[PDB]
Amino acid sequence: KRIEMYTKASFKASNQKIEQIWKTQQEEIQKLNNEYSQQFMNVLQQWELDIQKFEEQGEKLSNLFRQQQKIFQQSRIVQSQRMKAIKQIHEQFIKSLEDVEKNNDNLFELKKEMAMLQKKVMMET
Amino acid sequence: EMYTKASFKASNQKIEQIWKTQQEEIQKLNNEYSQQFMNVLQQWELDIQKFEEQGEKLSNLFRQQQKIFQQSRIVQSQRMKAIKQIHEQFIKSLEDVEKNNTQSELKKEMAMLQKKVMMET
Amino acid sequence: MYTKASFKASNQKIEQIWKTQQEEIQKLNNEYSQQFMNVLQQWELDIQKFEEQGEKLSNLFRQQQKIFQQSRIVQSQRMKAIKQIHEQFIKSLEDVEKNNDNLFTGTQSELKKEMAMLQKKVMMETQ
Amino acid sequence: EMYTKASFKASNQKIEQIWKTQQEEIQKLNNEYSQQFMNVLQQWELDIQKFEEQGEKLSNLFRQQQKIFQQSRIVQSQRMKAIKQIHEQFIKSLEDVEKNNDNLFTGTQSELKKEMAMLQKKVMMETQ
């Protein structure tokens, strides 16, 4: 009766110390598991922030690309437009000279003035 | 009279000849210029097309690198989301097993030990 | 006297015609050279502005290259850091498991020491 | 005396067995996680290489295209010189031809006046 109670008290105190040994070692493993999770969680949050900066950086240069691209197309067509222009100018020059040369054949007007000088000459004689 | 008309006609010739001789010189100057000019302009049309084609390629190369740029951003963000998924599953699993535990089965076998020491005593 | 007068009259009218026709030509020549030079100088500039944009592209291409290189570098740092964290975790468990398995200070020996005490405590008052 | 020592030793061994089996379960989870984790890192490390290989290949195709762009800009300048030269020589030739035509003694007006002056002399001579 009494012996049986005293041995129940001591079992409950040993049981308590046996738990605490188990708990202490599981608490220590938990602080490692947690400390490991925070460092691991902070590295992915940093990487996420890094991808954010990465994408914001790439987006500016996408707009910068665009402005140069419209300017780059305009300069291209002007380079070919100028060139057509000088071809046009040369072709109108050459044609306006051919046109002149045609009236040269008409003039070889001289013979008219000589026939007139000859008429005056004979009239004298 | 005949002697006059003859004289006028030989003179008329020599004057028309001086003129045309002088015209032909310039018109041969004109002709060789046009030809040389139009020949160089024509290969130049080609060269300037080539120019515009290299500038066109350099422009496609940027479009290719921005594609890769965005492809790299998508695959990082997916790898990163999957790393985080495995980790959170692992943490939840440990949290699950901890919550389950152990201290009762200790108390059970201590009861059994007590039972046999009461029995023996 | 009459014949010489009308000969010099004709000569002058002849020299003028030659001269007019020459002035027309030389007017076309100089008008053409003038335009030609104005449009070539202008072409020299537009060509030189094309180089400018083609050069700004190169600098934007190179700019993105560096950024592309920089992400790569950072990613490899981010990976090197989370590998170092993980392996520091893993070895930290190994060393915790090492102390718990200790023949004289680990948890099984501390259990046995409690069981050692309880059993003599119970035997003492019972017998 | 003997009955209690062997009863206590059997229970030591049972408890330590309770301990071990839960420890083995946790170490099972830690190992399965470590494998899966070191698996996605090696894929990430492959990912890193594949974009560098894409980066590097584009960089070298870009320098090649810029070199060809620069050899096309040099050609624009050579074409410019040639056409400038050809026009310069045309004008300069035009000028030389008009001086020679405007020479006082041998120009084309003084050939027009010489021809004219013979003709006038042919006419007068005979009429006398």
Numbering used by the authors:
A (entry chain C): 108 to 215, 221 to 237
B (entry chain D): 111 to 211, 218 to 237
C (entry chain B): 112 to 238
D (entry chain A): 111 to 238
Give the article text.
A highly-conserved meiosis-specific structure, the chromosome axis, assembles in early meiotic prophase and provides a scaffold for the organization of chromosomes as a linear array of loops, and also orchestrates the formation of DSBs and their repair as inter-homolog crossovers. Mammals possess two such proteins, SYCP2 (1500 residues in Mus musculus) and SYCP3 (254 residues), which are both required for proper axis formation and wild-type levels of crossovers, and are known to interact with one another through their C-terminal coiled-coil domains. Mammalian SYCP3 is known to form coiled-coil homotetramers that self-associate into larger structures both in cell culture and in vitro, but how SYCP3 cooperates with SYCP2 to mediate chromosome localization and axis assembly is not known. We further show that both SYCP2/SYCP3 and ASY3/ASY4 form heterotetrameric coiled-coil complexes that self-assemble into extended filaments, paralleling our findings with Red1.
We combined the truncations on both proteins to yield a minimal construct, Mm SYCP21325-1479:SYCP3105-248, which we term SYCP2CC:SYCP3CC hereon. We found that Mm SYCP3CC also forms homotetramers in the absence of SYCP2CC (not shown), and when we determined the structure of Mm SYCP3CC by x-ray crystallography, we observed an antiparallel coiled-coil homotetramer similar in structure to H. sapiens SYCP3. As SYCP2 and SYCP3 share limited sequence homology in their coiled-coil region, we reasoned that SYCP3 homotetramers may form through promiscuous coiled-coil interactions in the absence of SYCP2. To compare the stability of Mm SYCP3CC homotetramers with Mm SYCP2CC:SYCP3CC heterotetramers, we measured their melting temperatures (Tm) using a dye-binding assay. We found that the SYCP2CC:SYCP3CC heterotetramer is more stable than SYCP3CC on its own (56.0°C Tm versus 52.5°C), supporting the idea that the heterotetrameric complex is the preferred state when both proteins are present. While the SYCP3CC homotetramer is likely not the favored state in the presence of SYCP2, its structure may nonetheless be informative as to the structure of SYCP2CC:SYCP3CC. Overall, these data show that the SYCP2CC:SYCP3CC complex forms an extended coiled-coil tetramer with an overall structure similar to that of the SYCP3 homotetramer. Using sequence alignments and the structures of H. sapiens and M. musculus SYCP3, we generated physical models for SYCP2:SYCP3 where the monomers are arranged either parallel or antiparallel, and mapped all identified crosslinks onto these models. In agreement with our SAXS data, the crosslinking data strongly support a heterotetramer model with two SYCP2 monomers arranged parallel to one another and antiparallel to two SYCP3 monomers.
